[PDB]
């Protein structure tokens, strides 16, 4: 004789796609805009509750890579656009062990369109393309797009940006330890806004990203799949130090009325080529525990070899980085070059490139304008993108080389610890009731 | 004695406009855009219900003008503008039955602003005009034209029209509706059915077929500049074509922009056209004038005569066919008399276009490689009459060139959207217990 | 005992902000955004109710400002700019004042392959030395002007602001209200009284007069970097008129874009000048220092002095009439000295203007054909105080300008939005039964 | 129309030396490259030096190690030096020039144009290697 | 040096009739781009030298159309079609193809 009663507000939520917004304390990404949060944020645990979290079919990843396109698009829209920049370019190697920097001679409009203005400034190789001791250049985006360039205005750290869920829902943060990518949190809480998660610019490495509470996992949908990323987080920070002693010269030139370009100009001492530090030692112990996490996921007495990428565009198989201004790319190829069985410092080389895709996208290029004086680059490796070949029959020793190509792993990893769910604060369950007429 | 109530969600409705929306299933009109429509849309049929209809001061047509007209400048705002192609063109003849197409050529930019190249394209002579040998485009004396991107495509994909909540579209199935007045058969549907926003002028291309015969709608058929609408109940076949293998090859305007220019013609130069059957068109003509006899009475006579005069677009038949702009000449087919093979249309191409016949927003189609050949139903027809004197026993009648919104209207009659009033009160034996 | 009685719709207010709507009746502070207002006030009186009123801490100004800001450049983008125009211009002095200069310069024509000679007159103000015979336009080391899109006018149409639903405005109905102060009278309307958005600096024009006697505002008269602002109790006519009658020359630069320049001057060319009754000036400035006599008490020395110095936009009188902007030379009226038929003022005319002192956004004011009269009264003055460490009973006073919020600001004092609090509590005898 | 200004004119001693010069004025002359040629008496002309003054140095067969040239911009001229003089340099001398007057400056990228201008001739110094 | 030689060495018609005059080159003086550097100079007595031809056939603004000129390789010469009272004056031939220039002996061109 039991009777159906309604209920309301009972917890009950269930997973779904939603839009979110910004929260935070000029920048690209224009956060001045932000809704401020609160100086306290509250999170409340859950005892005796286990929910399933699927970190590699997220939509907080997508949600995040086409928000960071927008902000981009967005603040590079009132730049200055370089469409003139496209003419002809006699250039002439720049004197000192690289014969890379060129110093290229072109024309140029001013504040009034009847009258021209000759002009230099240095290109670095990977900006010009021949087109047949000083011969004509041009620029490698004039036959693909012209783009405008960074307002020196606005700088590029990546401050902190937390993800807030609106009104009716509520992200769940598994603080498990030592948990993977797919599987059940047996520990799980509530917190209405995201940790500060830094958008950081990088491919085949991390930067500045979340650190392993316990030691390093790896996380993948199934390492037997070679068509997947590996994603790998570290326990412990290796420092790497980044900078290039040139002192570079800026010099400010007035395309057109109002229109500012901000070109390279001489070189003041001695020219010398870009490189990167990191300590060996922590590097080796580092990758020790890699290998041994490795080993005890493909099995013990399997042989790990690390080699560097496997060829491709400058962008996916180099290390970019953003700072100072300019992208760095770095020739990776002095780490991943051992093998595993059973004071020192590496210099890694690097190059300078002005026009950037870091976004893979065609059409839409960045011109990022040079700084003045040193730049020191201080930051700190946190995780790896590695992936593995075949291997044919022979399982007995395996090889890992730096993956790359999809920007959406970066932030990925740092969005594995939450997920969106719909609450669904309408219930029904049977009771003794009985209304009165 | 006898006590007020108040009573929730009751039916009823009233005449008012709202912001309706779009619902559908690389084009002009994006179909992500719309939300996705019910595959299977309910239509719930009314009884013992009347209800007045105007589709003329409907308001579902004047929303349907303005999204159209945003869609296309929302569409052409990516891509690229046409300011540089404003040059001196030293142009010659092209060596056929006709000799309107033009091999002109023409200093132009190139990749990199400081050098320059020398180009040819093929022009027609309706968009080209002599400057003072050298001739330029009649655009750079009234704006920058943007051509159409070949991702974008004109095909016209059916949208269904919606309301949103607290308000019901009110569709009339009544046969032979007269247009304006009660409709003693009526039915409510969530959004309105498949319309394709078809842009033609004088004749109807894919549109809706009637259910009895041949109807006619007109604000006042007393008077004569108000235009009169037909609508038949069979469709009439028209098959157009271009002969002419167009080549399409790409010009780098400008970094990052390129330029598509007709490049050459191979093979014979022929006109273009369209075909109709004489007996069919025979046919609906007959019925046609029995309906406008029905309306004018017994023992008149009717004609039926070309465009009386004006542009170029109002006095011709323009439609799109794949890409390509026509401008058909439908004299031919607008001429008899009524007392008591097949026929070919000339037509010609035109690359800039004007539509909506606004200023400021001119086209330049890009052309299209091999042979276009497309078919279409005829349903619909936009007559004009002209002024008379005592009937003269007998009328004429011409095809008018008014604007999109009879286009659109001939399609939405049978539509009106109403704002809902669940509120309502009446008297009832009833007292309110303390 | 006594239980907690829960009250709703409890009429009791606090001080919050909030983004009001505009709301009005070819003009760029009304378009299509304003909502119509109702002509009936639904303005109630409230007795017994006295509320703290602070004119300075008001975010009205604040959000009038920005939404003016954004109507501006909503405004100016939908036509054509005047980037090309920064070339070489090759001037000659004018014969039959000696300021405008005849200046020609090269400039493309419908094609972009072509040039036209054109020539045009421009103010020694538009125009600076690059040499004595070359000049350029000004600001074109800056940002390229546009030019005042010729469809919508700088007509001052009232606006009226209205506060959404939960919000209320607050009227200090009470008379002699001196800015900073409880008002016993205060009044609740939902749309406040016409404002004129009329740009000006300096001296206030069609305003609001005050209510029986002159009017004295500031922050706290004991400073010197604050402004003052003073309110007229009777209007004071004033007539502006420039006898040239430029002529418009119709070039085009490009596909669909032209600009309007300075054609030559027919008859004697003669300066802009304005006239102000003698008398009513007299008085005004009478009762002025009457009323800051009792702030700064009598048998003292009341001095008026020109600016002292800094741009043209704050050193000089600015009009919005017509399309021409007009910049006078206001020391005249400030040169007097008080103890215990008509004022002409010279002015200059200017078309390239920053009007909100924003670097980079320049904007060209076309001329406009035959003479223009602008028939106005004052209503208020923005000065500022200087002086020494009280080592003399001598009190001098300079205009001021730059804050355009402050010459709004003497408008708006009279309203203040409040944001409603229906949730209310009380204590009574009652409880809940089962 | 362009012209030319030749100056440095003298008398010199059998092995002596003086100083050449020679200028130009009336147009921009763009790339414009001065030449040095005389005439023998009785004989036909004979190249002399080359200064490339707007934008390379050429010597002919009996001047080395005895003539030293130089260019100017501000004035466009261009400075000559010679030692060693000999009987046979008695001959006139006549500012040889390959003018390229611009036309028409562009102002903007689709008007671009050059006169293709003319070589002036000097009228001639007649330099005599004697008392 | 690149010497070349004129000829004839000297020449004189009655106005009337038509006129050439060649003068050809040690080597071909075609230079490695293809350009050619042929100018044609004519002195009267008493005054400078003038230009009437440039690179082979091309005609100087200023110069009579009458005058005309072709070749190719090495042979060049120069063709008027009618000589007038005004073309009385010393005739050169020069290139510049090469740094080192040669000029012609010079060539006289005497009316009646």
């Known amino acids: 004789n039991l009777w159906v009663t309604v209920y309301y507000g009972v917890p009950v939520w269930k997973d779904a796609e939603t839009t979110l917004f910004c929260a935070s304390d000029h920048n690209v990404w224009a956060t001045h805009a932000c809704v401020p949060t609160d100086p306290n944020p509250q999170e409340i645990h859950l005892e005796n509750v286990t929910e399933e979290f699927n970190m590699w079919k997220n939509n907080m990843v997508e949600q995040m890579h086409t928000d960071i396109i927008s902000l981009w698009d967005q603040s590079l829209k009132p730049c200055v656009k370089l469409t003139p920049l496209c003419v002809t370019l006699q250039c002439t190697n720049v004197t000192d062990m690289r014969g890379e920097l060129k110093n290229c001679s072109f024309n140029m409009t001013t504040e009034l369109r009847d009258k021209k203005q000759k002009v230099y400034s240095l290109f670095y190789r990977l900006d010009v393309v021949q087109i047949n001791s000083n011969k004509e250049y041009r620029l490698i985006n004039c036959n693909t797009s012209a783009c405008t360039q960074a307002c020196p205005k606005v700088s590029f750290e990546p401050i902190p940006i937390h993800y807030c869920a609106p009104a009716g829902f509520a992200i769940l943060k598994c603080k498990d330890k030592k948990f993977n990518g797919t599987g059940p949190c047996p520990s799980v809480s509530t917190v209405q806004c995201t940790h500060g998660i830094k958008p950081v610019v990088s491919t085949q490495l991390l930067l500045n990203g979340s650190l392993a509470e316990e030691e390093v996992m790896i996380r993948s949908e199934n390492i037997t799949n070679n068509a997947k990323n590996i994603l790998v987080q570290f326990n412990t920070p290796v420092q790497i130090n980044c900078t290039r002693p040139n002192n570079n010269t800026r010099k400010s030139i007035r395309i057109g009325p109002g229109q500012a370009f901000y070109a390279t100009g001489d070189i003041i001492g001695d020219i010398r080529q870009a490189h990167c530090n990191v300590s060996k030692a922590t590097w080796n112990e580092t990758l020790g525990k890699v290998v041994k996490q490795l080993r005890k996921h493909f099995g013990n007495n399997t042989i790990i070899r690390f080699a560097n990428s496997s060829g491709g565009d400058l962008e996916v198989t180099t290390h970019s980085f953003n700072c100072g201004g300019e992208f760095f790319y770095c020739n990776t190829s002095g780490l991943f070059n051992s093998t595993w069985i059973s004071n020192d410092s590496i210099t890694l080389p690097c190059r300078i490139k002005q026009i950037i895709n870091m976004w893979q996208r065609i059409g839409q290029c960045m011109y990022a304008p040079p700084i003045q004086g040193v730049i020191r680059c201080v930051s700190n490796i946190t995780g790896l993108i590695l992936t593995r070949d075949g291997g044919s029959t022979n399982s007995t020793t395996e090889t890992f080389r730096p993956g790359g190509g999809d920007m959406r792993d970066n932030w990925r990893s740092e969005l594995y610890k939450y997920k969106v769910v719909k609450i669904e604060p309408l219930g029904v369950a049977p009771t003794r009731c009985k209304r009165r007429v | 004695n006898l006590w007020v109530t108040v009573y929730y969600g009751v039916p009823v409705w009233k005449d008012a406009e709202t912001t309706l929306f779009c619902a559908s299933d690389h084009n002009v009109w994006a179909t992500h855009a719309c939300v996705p429509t019910d595959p299977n849309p309910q239509e719930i049929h009314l009884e013992n219900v009347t209800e007045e209809f105007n589709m003329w001061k409907n308001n579902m047509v004047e929303q349907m003008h303005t999204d159209i007209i945003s869609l296309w400048d929302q569409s052409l705002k990516p891509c690229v503008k046409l300011t540089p192609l404003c040059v001196t063109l030293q142009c010659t003849n092209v060596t056929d039955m006709r000799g309107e197409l033009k091999n002109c050529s023409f200093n132009m930019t190139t990749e990199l602003r400081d050098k320059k190249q020398k180009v040819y394209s093929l022009f027609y002579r309706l968009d080209v005009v002599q400057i003072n040998k050298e001739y330029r485009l009649i655009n750079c004396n009234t704006s920058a034209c943007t051509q159409a991107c070949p991702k974008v495509s004109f095909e016209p994909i059916p949208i269904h029209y919606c309301a949103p909540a607290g308000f019901a579209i009110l569709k009339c199935k009544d046969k032979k509706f007269n247009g304006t007045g009660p409709c003693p058969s009526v039915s409510t549907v969530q959004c309105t059915h498949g319309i394709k926003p078809v842009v033609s002028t004088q004749l109807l291309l894919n549109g809706s077929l009637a259910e009895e015969e041949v109807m006619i709608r007109s604000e006042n058929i007393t008077n004569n500049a108000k235009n009169i609408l037909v609508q038949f109940n069979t469709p009439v076949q028209i098959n157009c074509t271009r002969p002419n293998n167009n080549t399409r090859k790409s010009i780098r305007i400008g970094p990052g922009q390129a330029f598509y220019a007709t490049g050459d013609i191979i093979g014979d130069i022929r006109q273009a056209h369209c075909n109709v059957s004489k007996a069919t068109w025979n046919e609906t003509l007959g019925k046609v004038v029995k309906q406008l006899r029905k309306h004018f009475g017994n023992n008149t006579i009717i004609r039926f005569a070309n465009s009386s005069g004006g542009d170029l677009e109002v006095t011709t038949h323009s439609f799109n066919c794949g890409g390509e702009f026509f401008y058909c000449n439908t004299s031919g087919l607008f001429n008899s008399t009524w007392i008591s093979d097949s026929i070919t249309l000339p037509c010609r191409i035109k690359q800039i276009i004007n539509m909506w016949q606004r200023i400021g927003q001119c086209m330049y189609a890009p052309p299209i490689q091999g042979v276009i050949r497309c078919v279409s139903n005829i349903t619909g027809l936009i007559l004009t009459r002209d002024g008379g004197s005592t009937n003269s026993t007998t009328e004429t009648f011409r095809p008018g060139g008014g604007d999109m919104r009879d286009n659109w209207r001939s399609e939405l009659y049978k539509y009106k959207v109403v704002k809902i009033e669940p509120l309502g009160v009446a008297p009832t034996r009833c007292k309110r217990r303390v | 005992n006594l239980w907690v009685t829960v009250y709703y719709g409890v009429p009791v207010w606090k001080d919050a902000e909030t983004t009001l709507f505009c709301a009005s009746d070819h003009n760029v502070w009304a378009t299509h955004a304003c909502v119509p207002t109702d002509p009936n006030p639904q303005e109630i009186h409230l007795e017994n109710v006295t509320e703290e009123f602070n004119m300075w801490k008001n975010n009205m100004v604040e959000q009038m400002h920005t939404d003016i800001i954004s109507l501006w450049d909503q405004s100016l983008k939908p036509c054509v700019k005047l980037t090309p125009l920064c070339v070489t211009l090759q001037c000659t002095n004018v014969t039959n004042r000696g300021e405008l200069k005849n200046c020609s310069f090269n400039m493309t024509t419908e094609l972009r392959d072509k040039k036209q000679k054109v020539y045009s007159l421009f103010y020694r103000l538009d125009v600076v030395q690059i040499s004595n015979k070359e000049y350029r336009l000004i600001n074109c080391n800056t940002s390229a002007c546009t030019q005042a899109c010729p469809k919508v006018s700088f007509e001052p149409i009232p606006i009226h602001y209205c506060a959404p639903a939960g919000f209320a405005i607050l009227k200090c109905k009470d008379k002699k209200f001196n800015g900073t102060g409880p008002c016993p009278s205060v009044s609740t309307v939902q749309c406040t009284h016409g404002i004129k958005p009329v740009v000006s600096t300096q001296l206030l024009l069609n305003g609001s007069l005050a209510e029986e006697e002159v009017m004295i505002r500031s922050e706290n008269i004991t400073n010197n970097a604050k402004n003052i602002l003073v309110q007229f109790n009777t209007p004071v006519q004033i007539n502006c008129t420039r006898p040239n009658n430029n002529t418009r020359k119709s070039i085009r630069i490009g596909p669909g874009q032209a600009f309007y320049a300075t054609g030559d001057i027919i008859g004697d060319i003669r300066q802009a000048h304005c006239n102000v009754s003698k008398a009513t000036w007299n008085e005004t400035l009478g009762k002025v220092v009457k009323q800051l006599r009792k702030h700064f008490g009598n048998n003292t020395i009341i001095r008026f002095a020109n600016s002292s110095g800094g741009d043209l936009e704050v050193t000089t009188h600015s009009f919005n009439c017509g399309g021409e902007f007009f910049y006078c030379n206001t020391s005249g009226l400030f040169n007097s000295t008080w103890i215990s038929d008509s004022i002409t003022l010279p002015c200059r005319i200017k078309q390239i203007i920053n009007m909100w002192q924003r670097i980079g956004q320049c904007m060209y004011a076309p001329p406009i054909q035959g003479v223009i009269r602008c028939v106005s009264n004052i209503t208020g003055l923005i000065l500022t105080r200087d002086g020494g460490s009280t080592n003399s009973t001598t009190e001098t006073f300079r205009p001021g300008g730059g804050d355009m919020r402050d010459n709004w600001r003497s408008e708006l004092y009279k309203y203040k939005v409040v944001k409603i609090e229906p949730l209310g509590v009380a204590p009574t005898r009652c409880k809940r039964r089962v | 129309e362009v012209q030319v200004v030749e100056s440095g004119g003298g008398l010199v001693q059998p092995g002596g030396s003086l100083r050449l010069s020679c200028a130009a004025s009336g147009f921009t002359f763009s790339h414009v490259w001065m030449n040095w040629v005389r005439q023998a008496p009785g004989k036909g002309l004979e190249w002399v030096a080359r200064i490339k003054t707007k934008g390379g140095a050429h010597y002919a067969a009996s001047v080395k190690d005895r003539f030293s040239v130089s260019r100017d911009e501000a004035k466009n001229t261009a400075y000559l030096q010679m030692n060693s003089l000999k009987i046979e340099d008695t001959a006139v001398y006549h500012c040889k020039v390959d003018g390229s007057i611009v036309v028409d400056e562009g102002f903007d990228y689709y008007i671009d144009a050059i006169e293709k201008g003319f070589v002036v001739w000097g009228p001639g110094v007649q330099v005599t290697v004697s008392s | 040096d690149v010497v070349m030689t004129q000829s004839p060495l000297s020449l004189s018609i009655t106005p009337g009739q038509p006129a050439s005059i060649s003068c050809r080159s040690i080597?071909?003086?075609?230079?490695?781009?293809?350009?050619?550097?042929l100018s044609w100079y004519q002195q009267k007595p008493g005054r400078p030298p003038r230009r009437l031809i440039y690179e082979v056939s091309n005609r100087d603004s200023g110069v009579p159309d009458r005058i005309s000129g072709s070749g190719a390789g090495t042979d060049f010469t120069l063709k008027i079609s009618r000589v007038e009272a005004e073309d009385v004056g010393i005739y050169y031939c020069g290139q510049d193809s090469f740094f080192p220039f040669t000029f012609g002996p010079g060539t006289k061109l005497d009316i009646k």
């Open positions: 080597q071909s003086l075609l230079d490695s781009n293809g350009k050619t550097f």
